[PDB]
Amino acid sequence: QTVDDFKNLMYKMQETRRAIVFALLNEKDLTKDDVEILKRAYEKLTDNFQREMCTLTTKLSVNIGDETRGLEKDLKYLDALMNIRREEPNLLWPIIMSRVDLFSILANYHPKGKETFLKEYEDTVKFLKTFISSEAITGKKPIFITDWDGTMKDYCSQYATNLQPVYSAVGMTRFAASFTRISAVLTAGPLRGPGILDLTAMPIDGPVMFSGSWGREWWLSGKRVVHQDGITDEGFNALQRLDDEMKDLLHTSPFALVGSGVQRKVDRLTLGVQTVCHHVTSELSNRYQMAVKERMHNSQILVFDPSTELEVEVVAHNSGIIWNKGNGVERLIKSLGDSLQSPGKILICGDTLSDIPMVRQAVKQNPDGVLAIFVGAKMSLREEVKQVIGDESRCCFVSCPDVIHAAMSQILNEHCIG
Ligand SMILES: [Mg+2]
């Protein structure tokens, strides 16, 4: 019921998720002990309606809705898999996957009604098909770049338990390996704990290449490369030191675990001090913020600022060119043997305004030539992506990531399995 039991539960489970996905991609067998770990995390997360956790001196309510639905979906998926696997025990996983109706499983959970899901799905399939066709045209597989939060994954109320379900990890890995010469993922958060490498159910050294800090740090092929590109070397190491006195401090009661939960990025520390609506007892919020400037010591080079109600940042500029996702993308593609310039298609998937520099970059290099799936936002954003490219026949708007997941799964069933 406590914090560390929540964290530890979610993380051991997530590691198990990774193992399951491994079994599922590599043709190994699926232990019912694994699945059962999943099952138990699920049935605890619903017992005593969304649940609250505690230390000693503090207690806080936490929305576990995403964690729950993640687990739930995964369980009905995996069940379908295993009962088709129980015989024939040697049937290739992908074929079994083509027998499992993922569409109906995901086309329960969502904001519109079903028929919307259906049609967005149909459209998205069609779209993706056009992309694949790129490779029949140019004799090179195309490039795939995607945002994570909101885009490949539903939003989670807290960053630490933001956890990728199995089905999406599988579909994504398969899609990327089969259809693409490059698949990059750009996130705002850091790489490891708790970064996106820890949050993912996916291979990480395979066909998908994961980044964080908006492209400032990548995981490849086996290590982590980090582009500072700002004055200094000073408070890169200081941000490291501060992030330390923070590891130091969450020992105490307080709770790491709120909206973004103390992320160390390359250029900055970004910190949840408060939630929506109001939780975390504004007194304790204030005391902890001054624990934050406590640790912040010269007056050390780095600078505070209350970005918002709920969040806050410790920033290191000097310096910057003001790095965005476009730059992350370009740095990546150039680092490899490649270019967005090449003839063929680029598919980009995004959710907020932050993904637009990525489209700008893409069309700058390849105007013919770029595809975008955005999820699911307002007239303004829809209109903006329509703007930053041409038609509008190259734009696809869907309301949730599961539409993309189902479409991909379909495309895999059709082109891979026949
Ligand atoms: Mg996002």
Residue numbers in the entry: 63 to 110, 115 to 319, 323 to 366, 371 to 491
Q: What's written in the study?
A:
Here, we describe the structure of trehalose-6-phosphate phosphatase (T6PP) from Brugia malayi. This enzyme is essential to the organism; deletion of the gene encoding T6PP results in toxic accumulation of trehalose 6-phosphate. The synthase catalyzes the condensation of glucose 6-phosphate and UDP-glucose, forming trehalose 6-phosphate, and T6PP catalyzes phosphoryl transfer to water, forming trehalose. The overall T6PP structure consists of a three-helix bundle N-terminal domain (residues 63–157) connected via a short linker (residues 158–205) to the Rossmann-fold catalytic core domain (residues 206–292; 398–492) and the α,β-fold cap domain (residues 293–397), which together comprise the HADSF phosphatase structure.
The structure of B. malayi T6PP bound to Mg2+ was determined at 3.0 Å resolution (residues 63–491). Electron density was not observed for residues 1–62 and SDS-PAGE analysis of dissolved crystals revealed that this region was not lost during crystallization. Thus, we conclude that residues 1–62 are probably disordered and are not required for stability or catalytic activity. A single magnesium ion is observed to be coordinated in the active site by two waters and four residues (Motif I: Asp213, Asp215 (mainchain C = O oxygen), Motif IV: Asp424 and Asp428). In B. malayi T6PP, the cap was found to be in an open orientation relative to the core, though the crystal contacts were consistent with stabilization of the protein in this conformation and the protein may exist in alternate conformations in solution. Notably, the B. malayi T6PP has a slightly more open conformation than the orthologous T. acidophilum enzyme. The MIT-like domain is tethered to the core domain by a helical-connector (residues 158–206) that is comprised of a broken α-helix (helices 4 and 5), which interacts with both domains and a second, longer α-helix (helix 6), which selectively interacts with the core domain. In T6PP, an intramolecular interaction occurs at the interface between the first and third α-helices of the MIT-like domain and the C1-loop of the HAD core domain, leaving the solvent-exposed interface between the second and third helices free to make intermolecular interactions with other proteins. Although the cap-open, unliganded form was observed in the structure, site-directed mutagenesis coupled with substrate and inhibition kinetics identified five residues important for catalysis and/or substrate affinity. Notably, no single residue is critical to binding, consistent with a mode of binding of the trehalose moiety by van der Waals contacts and shape complementarity between the sugar and enzyme.
